[PDB]
Ligand binder design. Structure first.
Ligand code: CL
Ligand code: CL
Ligand code: MG
Ligand code: MG
Length: 145
């Protein structure tokens, strides 16, 4: 009863840019979605490499939050990257939290997948976080048109 999954596919305008940002230039989101994301700071490793550790300062529902994530997996062929949250506000609610971003690069799309284990049964499904990811996606696609 503690495990959960969420999946949302977002159609976008057209995808190499998106996977460039989430693999190699994640620091760009602070510029593209500056209300939501205050800071993206590499802590260990290189941008775009498995096992790199990234710190995020962000605002959700009017609350300032932080997360530290490790890039647990990359698939260059399917344009996918898997983040594991290891520290931060979300760890007060979830024992494990994994976010998979995958970009289909004609008509392109971004699929967000969350896999998580709640600490306790009464913890909410992370709908708010999913809405946040969707917002970031729309901000990327509409940046400096
Ligand atoms: Cl690598
Ligand atoms: Cl992956
Ligand atoms: Mg894989
Ligand atoms: Mg913990």
């Amino acid at each position: 009863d503690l495990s959960g999954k969420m999946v949302k596919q977002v159609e976008i305008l057209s995808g190499i840019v998106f996977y460039e940002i989430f693999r190699y230039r994640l620091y760009l989101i602070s510029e593209m979605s500056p209300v939501n994301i205050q800071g993206v700071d590499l802590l260990e490793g290189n941008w775009g490499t498995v096992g790199s550790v990234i710190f995020f300062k962000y605002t959700i529902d009017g609350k300032e939050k932080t997360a530290k994530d490790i890039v647990e997996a990359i698939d260059e062929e399917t344009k996918s990257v898997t983040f594991k949250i290891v520290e931060g506000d979300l760890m007060e609610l979830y024992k494990t939290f994994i976010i998979i971003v995958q970009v289909d690069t004609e008509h392109n799309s971004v699929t967000w997948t969350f896999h998580y284990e709640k600490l306790k049964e009464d913890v909410e499904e992370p709908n708010t976080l999913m809405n946040f990811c969707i917002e970031i996606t729309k901000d990327i696609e509409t940046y400096h048109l």
